[PDB]
Subunit: 294 residues, 4 copies
């Protein structure tokens, strides 16, 4: 059921606090632009620097604002199982449609550890769970064997956001976990090839600024029209690349600021772009004829 165009929403900041009015407008932005679901408090949403309480407040707020018009997925994981259980329980409590649980970063648990982590959370909270695999950030990877064991034991574990350049891994997951499981692209530039292999959508960064176009790419792929998919993919390629000229979400939050959707404010260790890179970004957005407010 998790499919289509999903946006990894940035978390607006103002006066060093979560900017709820901007977040609210961001939600409306996606409701009227065709986005299928919003992921709040994810990596792109700067969850590392959000307090545990801001996490629960943002999730609760998003659910209330969206109010069923679009799905709301909450980023509820970390590298501590007990903590992930509590936050996932909260998401369940406040009405979130699903929980995105990242593979534990930094402490590099064994595969048995990864199994017990996800199993513990899934058996504790009756909410759809999406595994989030991104080795380039977590410095560890959940094996397909482990994913298979997890999806088989917990009807609760239904999908995986894959931020991996290995198409072979996607093939393995699609083939082994079967049709009731859903693979979601964790990288905009790889959505087309991943969907050609059976992925059901993408949890996108580019979605933050060009919702309609990304949505179109997804529908073309879902329809099996890859001639049209390629057309959109190559048109959006420049955007996909520039959004990563610096560590995500630095570029995407900066782009949203340029479009007047939020304040140009991050929380350390994240910082504003280098003037040179920020100008490259502005120039790319202009080529797409986006209405820049700042």
């Amino acid at each position: 059921m998790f499919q289509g165009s999903i946006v990894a929403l940035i978390t607006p900041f103002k006066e060093g606090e979560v900017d709820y009015e901007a977040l609210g407008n961001l939600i409306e932005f996606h409701v009227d632009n065709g986005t299928d679901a919003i992921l709040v408090c994810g990596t792109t949403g700067e969850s590392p620097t959000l307090t545990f309480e801001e996490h629960e407040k943002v999730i609760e707020f998003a659910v209330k604002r969206a109010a069923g018009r679009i799905k709301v997925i909450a980023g509820t994981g970390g590298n501590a199982t007990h903590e992930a259980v509590h936050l996932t329980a909260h998401a369940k409590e406040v009405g979130a449609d699903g929980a995105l649980v990242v593979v534990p970063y930094y402490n590099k648990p064994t595969q048995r550890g990864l199994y017990e982590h996800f199993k513990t959370v899934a058996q504790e909270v009756d909410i759809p769970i999406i595994i989030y695999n991104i080795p380039s950030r977590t410095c560890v990877e959940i094996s397909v064997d482990t994913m298979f064991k997890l999806a088989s034991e917990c009807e609760n574990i239904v999908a995986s956001k894959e931020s991996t350049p290995n198409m072979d891994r996607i093939s393995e997951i699609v083939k082994r976990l079967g049709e009731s499981f859903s693979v979601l692209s964790g990288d905009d530039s790889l959505t087309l090839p991943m969907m050609a292999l059976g992925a059901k959508g993408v949890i996108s960064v580019a979605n933050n600024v060009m919702p309609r176009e990304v949505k179109e790419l997804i529908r073309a792929a879902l329809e099996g029209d890859f001639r049209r998919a390629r057309e959109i993919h190559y048109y959006l390629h420049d955007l996909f690349k520039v959004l990563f000229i610096e560590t995500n979400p630095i570029p995407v939050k900066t782009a949203c600021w340029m479009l007047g959707m939020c304040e140009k404010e991050f929380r350390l260790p994240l910082t504003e772009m280098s003037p040179e890179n920020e100008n490259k970004l502005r120039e790319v957005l202009k080529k797409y004829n986006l209405p820049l407010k700042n």
Copy 2:
């Protein structure tokens, strides 16, 4: 122009010499199974252990025996420019339809060195040239910038065999180089996603064993029917994987032996598979109900 199902043909040996009887039968095998072109003396053909002379002989043998019934591409590269020019000139003289020139391995030339290497070969020999990029073996990669410059300056540098797991590189090549350039998959398990991005075919290891099925996969992709492409892809997945249980071409040549197409003979440093892996290979081939003779 170079597209479809192309086989990276093994080079059969017998009594420590090239087995021309077996090589001839291999050519017949591909002529009546619909293969689009035969590539001889590539990595899968054990070019590393073939003398310059055997290279020359295998290429002429392939062209003459093919007798115009199937395209013949000659593997003519190495890591020394002078000899690459010489062998490529030979391929041209004996009527090869094209030359596959690998990115120099081991000596890791600079990008300028790669530019001069390929430019020299292309300008000296008027034969269509396919660049062969495989970083996992050569330990260096020809940048897209270098490829763009070469393709722009040399009319006969028309394609690239890409054995890379980076779909983004494929996107970059398709987008930056003309519609007049052809990208060929250099990895059987990656053919589907690469063609979804615009690749025109594959220089395959698997079609040595199942040419009809692989061509069917290519046909579906070219027609844009990725639903059918996926069915073939996943059907052939076990085959694609087992053929790399040990360094290519050890398993594929062993598979050809089991099918009775060649002797189970390699040239050191290559060796026969371990008894255990060989048995695992046989099990996979039986699963595909292949007519094993050995």
Copy 3:
């Protein structure tokens, strides 16, 4: 900061920090000559300790140590504001230094890393040790950034390097002051790093064979690498087995066998596979360690 420093494990007992075990651990190192105790590091399962447990463990280590042994507090994370607060607390309770890991997971730009450490350093007047371990953080603080940081912040005085790149060690030693201190972040690399100029090690092996490791350090610091090699190769098997599974799984299991703590981890960490635990036991018995479990 120099010598044999131990990246101490954090004992657990039925869901909570085991302070009696931790207390014995402190005396264990006071009695064996260890130069300093690092609490709440990766080896101490910092990832699964709440913020309150961090500050609690840090104060407990300082107060129970009572100046008998130097205490270093692991106070970093990937959020600058939190790191400042925890580092301030370490300073507040009297820790001798603060180990601040390079932000993990969010991969800050070098400018971000600069501002991260600068902020903590300028806010808390306590000696700071940068902790670089790319294999876990998935990002690396550049030597250019370290140079700039050490040049501007007088209290940024050292770096724990868990890197297999000896060239990076050479660049740091060469570019940063003679005063700056490079501490090995990998037991297996202590000898080569010290031959290059490193001042010591923040070890994992220290948790079970404090005297032998201290011996390795002394020989290296004395310039007697003939002897350092003798100790290095003798402890080689120990060094390797301690990483048969993700650290601190092996070392805590070893401490348990030695009767130094309960066999309890916090998920996602788990007990070793029975076959790897058997391997660990065999190695320990080979060093004739008095196992109690």
Copy 4:
């Protein structure tokens, strides 16, 4: 095999091997204390030399050196039959040893790696040095395979290790005999590898500063790492710049600047990017070297 060994460049002139220049290079090393010369190695552009030139260069070197300095012949490739014949030729013409690289590009299995070296070693009674450089060959010979080879063939006596993994060096030193010799395959890692037990280096840097490198090796062999460190750090800038571009592009260019050979490579190798060549010149000037070009 030990001490300071030079991976000699191969001078070219008008598309042919420049024997006059080569002879002078040999005298240069006899005059400056180099322990052995390796001809037709990666640094000597073996990839672009014909089998014929390989034979010619090796025979020329032995005849010129005439025992005043040891001569090691690069005789390997990724084809076993070919390596046997070239190695046989090296022994025939009087080479003191043969360096056989781990097969590149075709990625043999460990069994193939075993058979490759075993076949060469059993066919030719000449001391053999294994050359492991994963960054170029794209495969690595495991310590297990090395152990099996060294145990089986008395003439497989050493390994040139171009790896940044000190743990691999420790493993080789500990597992293989005291007789087996590990030689650094990277100038910047000679110090740490020797601190671990390596016996010398097959260097690129001593092509231009033979005396200084020799002193580094001597200090290390004597166990005086304080002195080894000052030389290591003194030569760091040189070690670094010699790899600003793929070796041997920088070192051959340096030799040309020193007037030791013509500025000529064989494609696919090319002259340095202009900006990089200028950076190289600056570094050599900093060392006050007598530049002729």
